[PDB]
């Protein structure tokens, strides 16, 4: 659905062979390989590795049998992988050939071409390289989730509160912050600040 870890897997052909291609959208970072059988199993293995290395929460597919098949679905279920790559594919070849005369198999040409596109910076004015943007982007996503869990954990404590010794206790609202003699709670759509005395907390 919608999760930062979005990738676009696709099959490209060359050398009477097929290269499974993975591309991290937000990043621009790639990671390809030459898969023997373009079956729904070779693609799936390709995910098991990737998913164990980078955080892959969701992927896209170009209908291909080796994609929509339930052969993949198995892994995607195991790893929790809910289920412009075009522009990159060409770029992949743009480099695979130039190096062709420096390696053995095509596979090596394929990887060397990757290594060249990832480290490949964006000029020189503060521009990073896909290998860097991906790491940055994910590093911040980890930090964002961190604060999220941090907030939901604190929400776990519920509060009842009131006003005068003549008012009524309301709630259970969710605790937001606690300090300086007061409690800050979110009653629903309101962020309220109540005196510690006019409040009662309980672990849910």
Ligand X SMILES: C[C@@H](CCC(=O)NCCC[N+](C)(C)CCCS(=O)(=O)[O-])[C@H]1CC[C@@H]2[C@H]3[C@H](O)C[C@@H]4C[C@H](O)CC[C@]4(C)[C@@H]3C[C@H](O)[C@@]21C
- Provide the binding-site residues for a second copy, judged by CB under 8 A: 31, 33, 45, 48-49, 51-55, 78-79, 107-108, 111-112, 114-116, 118-119, 125, 128, 131-132, 135-136, 138-140, 142-143, 149-150, 153
DSSP three-state, residue 96: helix
Residue 129 zone, left/alpha/beta (φ > 0; ψ -120 to 50; rest)? beta
- Work out how close the CB of 135 gets to ligand X at its nearest, in angstroms, rounded to a whole number: 23
Known binding residues for Mg(2+) are 10, 62, 86
- Work out how close the CB of 138 gets to a second copy at its nearest, in angstroms, rounded to a whole number: 5
Binds 138: which of ligand X, a second copy, none (CB < 5-8 Å by kind): a second copy
How far apart are the C-alpha atoms of 74 and 44, rounded to whole Å?
Answer: 8
Q: Is 178 a residue that touches ligand X (CB under 6 A)?
A: yes
- Per the DSSP assignment, residues forming a β-bridge with 185 are 175, 192
Binds 37: which of ligand X, a second copy, none (CB < 5-8 Å by kind): none
How far apart are the C-alpha atoms of 11 and 67, rounded to whole Å?
Answer: 10
Binds 45: which of ligand X, a second copy, none (CB < 5-8 Å by kind): a second copy
Nearest Cα to 91, choosing from 58, 68, 120? 120
By C-beta, is 99 or 201 nearer to ligand X? 201
Q: Would you call the peptide bond into 28 cis, given omega within 30 degrees of 0 as the criterion?
A: no
Binding range to ligand X, per CB under 6 A, among 6-14, 57-65, 93-101, 172-180: 172-180
Is-contact 196 181, C-beta < 8 A? yes
How far apart are the C-alpha atoms of 119 and 146, rounded to whole Å?
Answer: 29
Rounded to a whole number of angstroms, the CA Rg of the chain reads: 25
By C-beta, is 106 or 182 nearer to a second copy? 106
Binds 173: which of a second copy, ligand X, none (CB < 5-8 Å by kind): none
- Work out how close the CB of 176 gets to ligand X at its nearest, in angstroms, rounded to a whole number: 4
How far apart are the C-alpha atoms of 10 and 20, rounded to whole Å?
Answer: 6
Q: In the complex, which residues of this chain contact ligand X (CB under 6 A)? A: 150-151, 154, 157, 160, 169, 175-178, 184, 200-202
């Amino acid at each position: 659905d919608s999760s930062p870890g979005i990738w676009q897997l696709d099959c490209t052909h060359l050398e009477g062979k097929v290269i499974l291609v993975a591309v991290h959208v937000a990043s621009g970072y790639i990671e390809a390989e030459v898969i023997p059988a373009e079956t729904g199993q070779e693609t799936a293995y390709f995910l098991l590795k990737l998913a164990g290395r980078w955080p892959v929460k969701t992927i896209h597919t170009d209908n291909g049998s080796n994609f929509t098949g339930a052969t993949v679905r198995a892994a995607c279920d195991w790893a929790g992988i809910k289920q412009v790559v075009e522009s990159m594919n060409k770029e992949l070849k743009k480099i695979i050939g130039q190096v062709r005369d420096q390696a053995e198999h095509l596979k090596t040409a394929v990887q060397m071409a990757v290594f060249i596109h990832n480290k490949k910076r964006k000029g020189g004015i503060g521009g990073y390289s896909a290998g860097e943007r991906i790491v940055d982007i994910i590093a911040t996503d980890i930090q964002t989730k961190e604060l999220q869990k941090q907030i939901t954990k604190i929400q776990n404590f519920r509060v009842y509160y009131r006003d005068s010794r003549n008012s009524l206790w309301k709630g259970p609202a969710k605790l937001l912050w606690k300090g300086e003699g007061a409690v800050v709670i979110q009653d629903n759509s309101d962020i309220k600040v109540v005196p510690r005395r006019k409040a009662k907390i309980i672990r849910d």
